[PDB]
Amino acid sequence: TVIKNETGTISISQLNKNVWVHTELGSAVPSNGLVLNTSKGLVLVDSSWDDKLTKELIEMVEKKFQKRVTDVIITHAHADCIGGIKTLKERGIKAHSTALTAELAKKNGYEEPLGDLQTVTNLKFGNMKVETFYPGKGHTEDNIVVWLPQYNILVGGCLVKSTSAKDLGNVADAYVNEWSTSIENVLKRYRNINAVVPGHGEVGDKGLLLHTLDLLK
Ligand SMILES: [Zn+2]
C-alpha cells in the first residue's frame, strides 16, 4: 500500500500494520522516515526537508489515520530530518532529539528540538515500543538510530546507505573514520535485525549495514 500526494513528492508506504515509511523529495533526493500508528496518536521518525513538506506530510498522515502527530524523533540535525522543526512546534508536536542534536540544530539555524534522548532511550506510545540509540559519530556527530523491538525494524537513518548507493553522501560533517565503529555497535547491539530503513533508498536488511561498512573501507 503506497499512498502519496498528487505531485509525487510525498508518499507513504506500509511496512507492517502500524509501521509505515514516509518519503519526500528535496535538496531531487528521496529521504525516508517512519510513521507509527498508535492507539494514542501518531509518532513520526524524522520530519522533512522544509516546513512546507513537513506540514503537508503531517496534514496527510493525520487525515488518513484521523489522529494527531504527538511526537517526532529527529535522528540528526540536517534539513531532511529536522527541516520541519518550526512546524512541529506550532502544531504542538514534541520533537525529541539528543542534547547534541539540539545544540547542533541551533548551530545550523534551526529551532531547537527537545534534546531529551539519552544514549539509550525507550519510549512507549500506547502499544508501540520505540528505542533510540546513539552508536556514536558517523554520517554526522549526532546521528542516532531507531529500533522497534516488536517488529525488529531498525531505522539507520543516514548512518546506513542504500543497496545501490555507492556514495556516502555529504561527509563534510561526517566522521568517516569512526563511522565504521558506530555501525559495529548497532550491529553488536541488535542481534536479530529484520528490516533496516536507510536514510535514502529502499527498505533492506542487516545487509545494508555491511554494505555501508564496505563503502567506508
Ligand atoms: Zn544528514
Curated annotation (Swiss-Prot):
It catalyses: a beta-lactam + H2O = a substituted beta-amino acid. It comes from Bacillus cereus. It is an enzyme of class 3 (hydrolase). InterPro entries: BcII-like_MBL-B1 (IPR047917), Beta-lactamase_class-B_CS (IPR001018), Metallo-B-lactamas (IPR001279), NDM-1-like (IPR050855), RibonucZ/Hydroxyglut_hydro (IPR036866). Its EC number is 3.5.2.6. GO terms for biological process: antibiotic catabolic process; response to antibiotic. One of its GO terms (cellular component) is periplasmic space. Inhibited by captopril stereoisomers and iodoacetate. Also inhibited by chelating agents such as EDTA. It is found in: Periplasm. This is Metallo-beta-lactamase type 2. The keyword Plastid does not apply. The lineage of its organism: Bacteria, Bacillati, Bacillota, Bacilli, Bacillales.
